[PDB]
Design a binder for these strands. Structure first.
Ligand SMILES: [Mg+2]
Ligand SMILES: [Mg+2]
Ligand SMILES: [Mg+2]
Ligand SMILES: [Mg+2]
Ligand SMILES: [Mg+2]
Ligand SMILES: [Mg+2]
Ligand SMILES: [Mg+2]
Ligand SMILES: [Mg+2]
Ligand SMILES: [Mg+2]
Ligand SMILES: [Mg+2]
Ligand SMILES: [Mg+2]
Ligand SMILES: [Mg+2]
Ligand SMILES: [Mg+2]
Ligand SMILES: [Mg+2]
Ligand SMILES: [Mg+2]
Ligand SMILES: [Mg+2]
Ligand SMILES: [Mg+2]
Ligand SMILES: [Mg+2]
Ligand SMILES: [Mg+2]
Lengths: 80, 82, 129, 150, 205, 123
RNA sequence: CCCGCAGAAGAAGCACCGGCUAACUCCGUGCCAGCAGCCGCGGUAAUACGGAGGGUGCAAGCGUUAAUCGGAAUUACUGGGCGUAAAGCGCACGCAGGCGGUUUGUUAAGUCAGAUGUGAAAUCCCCGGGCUCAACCUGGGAACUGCAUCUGAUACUGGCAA
RNA sequence: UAGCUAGUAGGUGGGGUAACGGCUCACCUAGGCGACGAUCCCUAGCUGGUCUGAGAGGAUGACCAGCCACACUGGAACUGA
């Protein structure tokens, strides 16, 4: 592939309007402590299947909707 | 059309040109793509004064680019090989 | 509340030392051990010992040179609140070279003298001179 | 190679039935030029008496510090009362740059090329003192091996 | 630019001879050096560390006839140039043409030797250099221009030039009135009575 | 203290009020003399200090000191003023540039003439 | 840029000198006039006011004002504090958040390694070269301590499992 | 300033653009954003860099170069690569 992320779902409840979280860890550029900088992404999944709390793999595509430039590639786990 | 020309980074009454490839419509001493030589018109008999990366130049020229009256002149003066 | 064991080591030492105390004990752990090693190997203590199976138990023998203790200063450097990670070119060298810095790399818990040689970096656990 | 120099001379007041009775205080530092340095204080109703009464105190009261040629081996911190001092090896170019008053002890001491700064109060009597104990605590660029090796 | 005032007044305050009347006589007197740079000149200045630090550099400055601006820059340079700031200072200070002119004995005083430069009557490796601070360097060769060669001043000049210690890093002639800067003067040449690390300290805080 | 703490609320650098609202950092400003006073100074001192209130080109109305010995300065005089308090006259935070606009230079000054705007007397 | 010509001829001023801070005397004045960055000078011997002579510092600039950083470890990440000096919420419970004993497996996000691309030129710096020097101009390096992809390493942290 | 949001968030089809696209429309879903700071208020061109500082930092964005934006103020398109 050309790059790809994962992250838990967080919201399935909309006609392919799936949203995915992506927690990271980063050095605070001033006080060293590592802290959690989350990223939410509006990703397309056809035939709605990824479920709230599913981990999922994601790739970056052309603009689907205003807001959507990512599609899913796979799934990973369920029933959290 | 992209062109090779003399950008002039001299100094009042002591000019010293940076010869350069660029978008012909850009300012003389402005946005360029790469430097491909220099031409010191004071240079003097001493030594250096017209270093010129012929390899890239005539690759841009083939690539499509074109050349100043005063640049091509430095080339049929630099001779080319010896 | 016992949220940083390594500090408790560094300090059970530091204290027990300043209390010219020969021995010292504490609950153990792979991580404690790997350090006790470097402390022995680099020779800031005589030798360690873990006595038990259910509830393991590090035991450290403190060195004393002249009247003084051998460990002039043992200080945490990374910690839960604020963690540290230097690369290789940026690893610290304590007392200009004298004494040393414990550092955990992907290839085990070594000194800065070591990691520098190993050519890699890690989390600088603590300083000791 | 006697080498000595006073750092700060000051006046003080005692106050009695009859008024204020003043006096002076010198603070001095003597060093041999190859380690070995001490400071002396000493106070007296008049200045020359006190600056001299001081010089002596220093001749006794004299520590010695493990140099490393012209410089310190590693960096060191010193801290007496309100003064927190810090000085550093410095692969000499010139060096000897420091807070005149701890430049005093540093040159007689024989260090030839260090950088220092004094934090907290620059109260002379406590810097020249914080630095001494500083150099003092410093240790054997070799006989850490003494400690270890073993 | 150039100081321009009474010359001895300086030597008196700086406490030492600065060779500003460099000419004929020696070991002053015929002046009054020391005990009165002014109306209270006698009085002893129990002076501070800042005082002494100030006067040393001031001394070195009154010596080569240089003003604060240039001098401050000389320091700035020395500091940059590798190896001991205080020395390079002196090096730079000596590489001065006007100085290398006087040193080779073409001029009684450093001043005279300088006026010489200013008056296009001097020539590094051939061509005329009429600016005092021209940096002279190894192998360079300075020579009085034929035009005004063996003229009043420069005779006497090259004369009592041998009365002086006579340098080392250079090689006079006196016939062809030319001289060759063999090497950048070592620390050990010159000085003793000048204490760099003071004028270093001065410009160091 | 804590790294969390500092992370949540970073350290902030005390920003510095001026001591001389000669508005926007200005080397000096022009103004017109509202009053030409002379009040007396504070505690230790005792005198009759010459001052003036000036409406400034920029709206501010402020009292400024008139340096020197003596001055023809009156209501409607057009003056220039620079930073410089006068600790003695509390609430006086500016000085009047003697020798500017309509402000005379001190008469007969020989020393320090550039302050107290006086021209080199004919040698 | 070069040559001749005349005559030293056309070319020195500004701040300061009580302490911090290099530089001291007299006279005038007398809590007045006035000085003053901070401390503080002025009521009869004022090195602090004003003039003078002297001196110190700069010098075609010199001082004053304004302005940023510095020293200020005086917002302390590097690098600080809270009993009596500024500072522990009157007390407790507790959501979020932060942190979390110990063992094995797995994960490889943090973390570490390497490779590659990228990080415009100028600037800064190092060695040079060109203008009488210098400023200035300029060849070439170095540096851009960053970012991204891939591949690795798994001690430590995070996830997962028991 | 603690809630903000109806083309709003998404889907389906037509239209549309040099092009992907709520870009537009019609219908369907009831979504979307937010205490890791939305919304609202205030200030502001950004950068290379500049000055300072041992550094870390602090301050700054003239002159040179790069990007953006504006051309009396608000609005609109036409021509044309
Ligand atoms: Mg005692
Ligand atoms: Mg000049
Ligand atoms: Mg003095
Ligand atoms: Mg005055
Ligand atoms: Mg009197
Ligand atoms: Mg600071
Ligand atoms: Mg404090
Ligand atoms: Mg209190
Ligand atoms: Mg309480
Ligand atoms: Mg643990
Ligand atoms: Mg660059
Ligand atoms: Mg040159
Ligand atoms: Mg784990
Ligand atoms: Mg459609
Ligand atoms: Mg604006
Ligand atoms: Mg600092
Ligand atoms: Mg312009
Ligand atoms: Mg319009
Ligand atoms: Mg069209």
């Amino acid at each position: 592939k050309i790059r790809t992320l994962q992250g838990r779902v967080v919201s399935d409840k909309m006609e392919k309007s799936i949203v995915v979280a992506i927690e990271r860890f980063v050095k605070h550029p001033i006080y060293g402590k590592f802290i959690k900088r989350t990223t939410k992404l509006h990703v397309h999944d056809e035939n709605n299947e990824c479920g709230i709390g599913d981990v999922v793999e994601i790739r970056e595509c052309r603009p689907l909707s205003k807001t959507k430039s990512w599609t899913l590639v796979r799934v990973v786990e369920k029933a959290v | 059309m992209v062109t090779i020309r003399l950008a002039r980074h001299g100094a009042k009454k002591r000019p010293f040109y940076q010869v350069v490839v660029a978008d012909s419509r850009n300012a003389r001493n402005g946005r360029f793509i790469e430097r491909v030589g220099f031409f010191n018109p004071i240079a003097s008999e001493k030594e250096e004064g017209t270093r010129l990366d012929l390899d890239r130049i005539a690759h841009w020229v083939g690539q499509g680019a074109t050349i100043s009256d005063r640049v091509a002149a430095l080339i049929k003066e630099v001779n080319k090989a010896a | 509340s016992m949220q940083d064991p390594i500090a408790d080591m560094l300090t059970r030492i530091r204290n027990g030392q300043a209390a010219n105390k020969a021995a010292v004990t504490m609950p153990s752990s792979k991580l404690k051990v790997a350090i006790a090693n470097v402390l022995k190997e680099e020779g800031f203590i005589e030798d360690f010992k873990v006595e038990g199976d259910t509830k393991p138990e590090l035991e450290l023998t403190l060195k004393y040179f002249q009247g003084k203790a051998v460990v002039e200063s043992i200080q945490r450097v990374s910690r839960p609140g604020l963690r540290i990670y230097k690369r290789k070119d940026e690893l610290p060298k304590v007392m200009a070279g004298l004494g040393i810095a414990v550092v955990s790399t992907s290839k085990g818990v070594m000194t800065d003298r070591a990691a520098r040689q190993a050519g890699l970096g890690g989390e600088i656990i603590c300083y000791v001179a | 190679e006697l080498q000595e120099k006073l750092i700060a001379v000051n006046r003080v007041s005692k106050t009695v039935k009859g008024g204020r009775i003043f006096s002076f205080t010198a603070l001095t530092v003597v060093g041999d030029g190859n380690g070995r340095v001490g400071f002396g204080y000493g106070k007296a109703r008049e200045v020359p008496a006190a600056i001299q009464k001081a010089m002596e105190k220093a001749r006794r009261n004299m520590i010695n510090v493990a140099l490393n040629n012209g410089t310190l081996q590693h960096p060191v911190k010193g801290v007496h009362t309100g003064s927190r001092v810090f000085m550093q090896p410095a692969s000499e170019g010139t060096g000897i740059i420091a807070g005149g008053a701890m430049r005093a002890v540093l040159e007689v001491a024989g260090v030839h090329n260090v950088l220092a700064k004094a934090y907290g109060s620059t109260n002379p009597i406590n810097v020249v003192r914080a630095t001494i104990d500083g150099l003092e605590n410093m240790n054997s660029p070799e006989m850490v091996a003494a400690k270890r090796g073993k | 630019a150039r100081y321009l005032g009474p010359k001895l007044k300086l030597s008196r305050r700086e406490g030492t001879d600065l060779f500003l009347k460099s000419g004929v006589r020696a070991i002053d007197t015929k002046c009054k050096i020391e005990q009165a740079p002014g109306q209270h000149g006698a009085r002893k200045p129990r002076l501070s560390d800042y005082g002494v630090q100030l006067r040393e550099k001031q001394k070195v400055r009154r010596i080569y006839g240089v003003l604060e601006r240039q001098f401050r820059n000389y320091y700035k340079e020395a500091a940059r140039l590798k190896g001991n700031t205080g020395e390079n200072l002196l090096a730079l200070l000596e590489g001065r043409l006007d100085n290398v002119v006087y040193r080779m004995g073409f001029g009684a005083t450093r001043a005279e030797a300088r006026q010489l430069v200013s008056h296009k009557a001097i020539m590094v490796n051939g061509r005329v250099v009429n600016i005092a601070s021209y940096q002279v360097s190894p192998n360079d060769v300075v020579s009085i221009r034929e035009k005004a060669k063996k003229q009043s001043r420069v005779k006497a000049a090259l004369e009592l030039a041998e009365q002086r210690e006579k340098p080392t890093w250079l090689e006079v002639d006196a016939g062809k009135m030319e001289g060759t800067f063999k090497r950048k003067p070592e620390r050990s040449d010159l000085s003793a009575d000048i204490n760099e690390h003071l004028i270093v300290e001065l410009y160091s805080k | 203290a804590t790294v969390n703490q500092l992370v949540r609320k970073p350290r902030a650098r005390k920003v510095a009020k001026s001591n001389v609202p000669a508005l926007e950092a200005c080397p000096q400003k022009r103004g017109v003399c509202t009053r030409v006073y002379t009040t007396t100074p504070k505690k230790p001192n005792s005198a009759l200090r010459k001052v003036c209130r000036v409406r400034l080109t920029n709206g501010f109305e402020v009292t400024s000191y008139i340096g020197g010995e003596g001055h023809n300065l009156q209501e409607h005089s057009v003056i220039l003023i620079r930073g410089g308090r006068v600790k003695d006259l509390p609430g006086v935070r500016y000085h009047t540039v003697r020798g500017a606009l309509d402000c005379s230079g001190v008469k007969d000054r020989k020393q320090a003439r550039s302050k107290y705007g006086v021209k080199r007397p004919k040698a």
